[PDB]
From a paper:
Mechanistically it is thought that, in the presence of Dkk, Krm forms a ternary complex with Lrp6, which is then rapidly endocytosed. KRM1ECD emerges as a rigid molecule with tight interactions stabilizing a triangular arrangement of its Kringle, WSC, and CUB structural domains.
Despite the lack of high-resolution diffraction, the general architecture of the ternary complex is revealed. DKK1CRD2 is sandwiched between LRP6PE3 and KRM1Kringle-WSC. KRM1ECD does indeed bind on the opposite side of DKK1CRD2 with only its KR and WSC domains engaged in binding. Although present in the complex subjected to crystallization, we observe no density that could correspond to CRD1 or the domain linker (L). Similarly, the K226 side chain of DKK1, which points to a small hydrophobic pocket on the surface of KRM1 formed by Y108, W94, and W106, forms salt bridges with the side chains of KRM1 D88 and D90.
Numbering used by the authors:
A (entry chain B): 30 to 97, 103 to 322
B (entry chain A): 628 to 1005, 1013 to 1246
C (entry chain C): 182 to 249, 259 to 266
The structure:
């Protein structure tokens, strides 16, 4: 996966088309001087801009895009889909994809819908039209069919940097995403900060149990790591002994990746009472 | 005024004030229960601020200190996105995109009148000019435009057609120019007071929304940049951001005395007008009246609508007229209305009566809304009522005790006129001109319509077959016709007051009738599930006509004719109740008796009533 | 099902000649645009997200093209 954010802000891939089928070719960021975003405004490669025409998201909108009175289009990138984001699916009405429960909120985000569905004990959470949340334990949320991720690009009413479905189009999320704690038993999965994809709240103390019976070692990587303060810190603990393996805070970034020869690791997170940030996304990969 | 001009702006949950300086103090106005504030105006003379709430569906006001929080308008509003204060005449103008009406009332709220209703398609912003007597508004239809009219809703005309969704319409009174933001093209344009000499002030703006002006600057709000900015009004340069980090700023305004300057005849003694004083460009002003009221020949005083038709929903009682200009139906502003079941009107005192189904009481109030009074309370469960206008009584049916109980308008009870073990009176309509009453007796297995005298004597079953749910009754005293509607059988039938000549008027494309009333030579009725007011010609000249549609939860409908006071007093129970203590009956030969309820008996006076 | 002005979530909730578009911070059934009527066309990309007064799409066999500045529904 090339994205671990809700809107592909960290996308640095090689797709230079608005869609792989029936799309339009993107313009180069080093020759879009008519427009706001280009290489002259942003030297040092800020926001992933450079001498290329690959899709990017520098402005902080709901999805990656490129220039092409239509002078831009959203990029339908298959790889750019954050682990946890199960996909954009259709909603033809009665019954809905997720049948558990539902609410409406004028301050809705991806997390606030997830936190609502997690609070009612539902595994899946789905946002529609920017403001309508839906919850359920339904295995057939795909019943009406999968839609293109560009069709689920209506802004969340609380946060304009996030996608929250569309007109008869539901973006789904596993309720483990942004939960203050949880158990992980898959070969490979991602663990986000609390309240992701919103900014993590102050005074959080959350811990996630990664345990893969049979794994010789686990390959931890940090595709996203935006922790503000030194008092804020992400810790990896040995599951058996509870010994602190590593400490990562604002003034101590993690590597690209590192191996831990264990089948049982406890990721911890501690948030202070000063400043908030986007958070993190720890992709682990067990090896047998 | 000597205080410096300060900037007010609405922002969803709260309204805040700031100075003209960059990054100066920012304080919220201490208001309570504000959910979604949109439009914004003020009154410097009263030291008051006015705003519209699209979540509450209201137009409120309060002082700068936060005290005197009161809802000025809170009925018949869907999306009041535009609003403005007539400071000279002391009136409150507003525009509603959902209902498609430009309305006006006093600043406190009373005497509401619709100025523009025909040919409106979502009027958004609103800018008044009571010194000159013009009002200007932006329109967000299929073809958006900026129209102009006189402040009495006269002389309507399109000022600039070729424009997008214009917002923040504001008048530069010193140099005589109109300014507005455009949401489609994202620019601030300017033109003179006739919509010519059109110039673009600022084109390179991301999302300019709210707008106002003062001295030699324009102040606008931006959704993209999240800021309140200003610039030179003519040039569009000398640009400075006043405030930042402001999410979803709706409207912006300059609070100063020089903004509300000028003068007209309405500022002096309200132009001697009885209700409303409306400024005009040619002739100074003109005296307006409330909705439906007729302005008298003297061009000052008003009289309430002579003839009108009342129809009630679950949570409101409406009023409509039969005008050539299809004048729009209004919601009567009664605060006491929660769950109405039936309605009836007293044309002598001009007051509205209804049955609250939840609270179980017969309440009273005039069309204004004031002079509220409960006449019957508790067990008692009123179903339907019918007012004897001559004897000053209400004949109503109780679902609890199963009786036709009669009560005075003031409150005190007359007595029960009809009771039985197996009897269940439900629908009720009186005919005191002839001296009879008509009611649906829904007995178990066998429903039936019955006639009786107003004391409960001379009972007889008019119809006992071809019935299932006799739900609503209505009669015409002039032509001598009785009408009833059936819910289950899905039809409206008719006959004479005697019972002969039973004919089915309509029995197709009807689902659930719940009310009947006669207006001139037309039988108006209401359908709950279809959600339509429809009518048919009783003579049979003209066809079936649909009056209105999309009216949810229709309960009861009632026509009101103007009371002929001379012809009223020809009725012998009109004056002194015919000398009777309780019921005043009319004989077949036009002479009056005096009768009593069940529990009383007529005495040797043949007037008073005593117990057996 | 939903009438013009009634609260909706999806366009399926509304009637035949209506679509579900956002007004302020809730969606209501608005009518679909016919030939000649003004349609939405976003200049900036962020203005799509900031739009709280959404118009419906142009009808069957209509495209949101420029007038001959604003855009109107015109045939192909
Ligand atoms: Ca913190």
């Amino acid at each position: 996966p090339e994205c671990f954010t809700a809107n592909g802000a960290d996308y640095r891939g090689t797709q230079n088309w608005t869609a792989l089928q029936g799309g339009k070719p993107c313009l180069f960021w080093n020759e879009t001087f008519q427009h706001p975003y280009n290489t002259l405004k942003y030297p040092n490669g800020e926001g992933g801009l450079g001498e290329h025409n690959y899709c990017r998201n520098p402005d902080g909108d709901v999805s990656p895009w490129c220039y092409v009175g239509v002078y831009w289009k959203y990029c339908e990138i298959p790889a750019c889909q954050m682990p946890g984001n199960l996909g954009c699916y259709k909603d033809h009405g009665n019954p809905p994809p997720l049948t558990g429960t539902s609410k409406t909120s004028n301050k809705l985000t991806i997390q606030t819908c997830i936190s609502f569905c997690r609070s009612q004990r539902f595994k899946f959470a789905g946002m529609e039209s920017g403001y309508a949340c839906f919850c359920g334990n339904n295995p057939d949320y795909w019943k009406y069919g999968e839609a293109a991720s560009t069709e689920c690009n209506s802004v969340c009413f609380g946060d304009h940097t996030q996608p929250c479905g569309g007109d008869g189009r539901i973006i789904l999320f596993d309720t483990l995403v942004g939960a203050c704690g949880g158990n992980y038993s898959a070969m490979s999965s991602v663990v986000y900060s609390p309240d992701f994809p919103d900014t993590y709240a102050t005074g959080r103390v959350c811990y996630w149990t990664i345990r893969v019976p049979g794994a010789s070692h686990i390959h931890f990587s940090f595709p996203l790591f935006d922790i503000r303060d030194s008092a804020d810190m992400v810790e990896l603990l040995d599951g058996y002994t509870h010994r602190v393996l590593a400490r990562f805070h604002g003034r101590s970034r993690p590597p690209l990746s590192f191996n831990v020869s264990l089948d049982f690791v406890i990721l911890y997170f501690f948030s202070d009472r000063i400043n908030q940030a986007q958070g993190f996304a720890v992709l682990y990969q067990a090896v047998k | 005024a000597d205080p410096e001009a300060f900037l007010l702006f609405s922002r969803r949950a709260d309204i805040r004030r700031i100075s003209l300086e960059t990054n100066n103090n920012n304080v919220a106005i201490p208001l309570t229960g504000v959910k979604e504030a949109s439009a914004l105006d003020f009154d410097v003379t009263d030291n008051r601020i006015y705003w519209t709430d699209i979540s509450l569906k209201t137009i409120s006001r309060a002082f700068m200190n936060g005290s005197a929080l009161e809802h000025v308008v809170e009925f018949g509003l869907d999306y009041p996105e535009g609003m403005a204060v007539d400071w000279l005449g002391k009136n409150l103008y507003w525009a509603d995109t959902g209902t498609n009406r430009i309305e006006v009332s006093k600043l406190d709220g009373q005497h509401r009148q619709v100025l523009v209703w025909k040919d409106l398609d979502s009027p958004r912003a609103l800018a008044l000019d009571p010194a000159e007597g013009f009002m200007y508004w932006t329109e967000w239809g299929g073809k958006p435009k900026i129209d102009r009219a006189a402040m009495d809703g006269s002389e309507r005309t399109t000022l600039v057609p070729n424009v997008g969704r214009a917002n923040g319409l504001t008048i530069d009174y010193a140099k005589r120019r109109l300014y507005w933001t455009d949401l489609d093209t994202n620019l601030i344009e300017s033109s003179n007071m006739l919509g010519l000499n059109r110039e673009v002030i600022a084109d390179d703006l991301p999302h300019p929304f709210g707008l106002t002006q003062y001295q030699d600057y324009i102040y606008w709000t931006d959704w993209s940049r999240r800021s309140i900015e200003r610039a030179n009004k003519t040039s569009g340069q000398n640009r400075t951001i006043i405030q930042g980090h402001l999410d979803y700023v709706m409207d912006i305004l300059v609070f100063h005395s020089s903004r509300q300057s000028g003068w007209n005849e309405c500022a002096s003694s309200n132009g001697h007008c009885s209700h409303l004083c409306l400024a005009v460009p040619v002739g100074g002003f003109v005296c307006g009246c409330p909705a439906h009221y007729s302005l008298n020949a003297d061009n000052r005083t008003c009289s309430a609508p002579t003839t009108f038709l009342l129809f009630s929903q679950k949570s409101a009682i409406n009023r409509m007229v039969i005008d050539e200009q299809q004048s729009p139906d209004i919601i009567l502003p009664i605060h006491s209305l929660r769950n109405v079941r039936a309605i009836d009107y007293d044309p002598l005192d001009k007051q509205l009566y209804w049955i609250d189904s939840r609270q179980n009481m017969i309440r009273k109030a005039q069309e204004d809304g004031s002079q509220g009074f409960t006449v019957v309370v508790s067990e008692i469960q009123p179903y339907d009522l019918s007012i004897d206008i001559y004897s000053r009584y209400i004949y109503w049916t109780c679902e609890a005790t199963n009786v036709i109980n009669v009560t005075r308008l003031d409150g005190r009870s007359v007595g029960v006129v009809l009771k039985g073990e197996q009897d269940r009176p439900r629908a009720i309509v009186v005919n005191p001109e002839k001296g009879y009453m008509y009611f649906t007796n829904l007995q178990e297995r066998s429903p039936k319509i019955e006639r009786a005298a107003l004391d409960g004597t001379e009972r007889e079953v008019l119809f006992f077959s071809g019935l299932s749910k006799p739900i609503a009754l209505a009669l015409d005293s002039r032509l001598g016709k009785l009408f009833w509607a059936d819910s289950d059988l899905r039809r409206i039938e008719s006959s004479d007051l005697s019972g002969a000549n039973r004919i089915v008027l309509e029995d197709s494309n009807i689902l659930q009738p719940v009310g009947l009333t006669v207006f001139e030579n037309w039988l108006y009725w209401i359908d709950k599930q279809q959600q339509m007011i429809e009518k048919i010609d009783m003579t049979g000249r003209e066809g079936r006509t649909k009056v209105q549609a999309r009216i949810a939860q229709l309960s009861d409908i009632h026509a009101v004719k103007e009371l002929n006071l001379q012809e009223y007093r020809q009725h012998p129970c009109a004056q002194d109740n015919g000398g009777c203590s309780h019921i005043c009956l009319v004989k077949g030969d036009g002479t009056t008796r005096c009768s009593c309820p069940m529990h009383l008996v007529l005495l040797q006076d043949e007037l008073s009533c005593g117990e057996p | 099902k939903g009438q013009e002005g009634s609260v909706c979530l999806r366009s399926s909730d509304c009637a035949s000649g209506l679509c579900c578009a956002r007004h302020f911070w809730s969606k209501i059934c608005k009518p679909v645009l016919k030939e000649g009527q003004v349609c939405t066309k976003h200049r900036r990309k962020g203005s799509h997200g900031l739009e709280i007064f959404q118009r419906c799409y142009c009808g069957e066999g209509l495209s949101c093209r420029i007038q001959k500045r604003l855009h109107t529904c015109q045939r192909h």
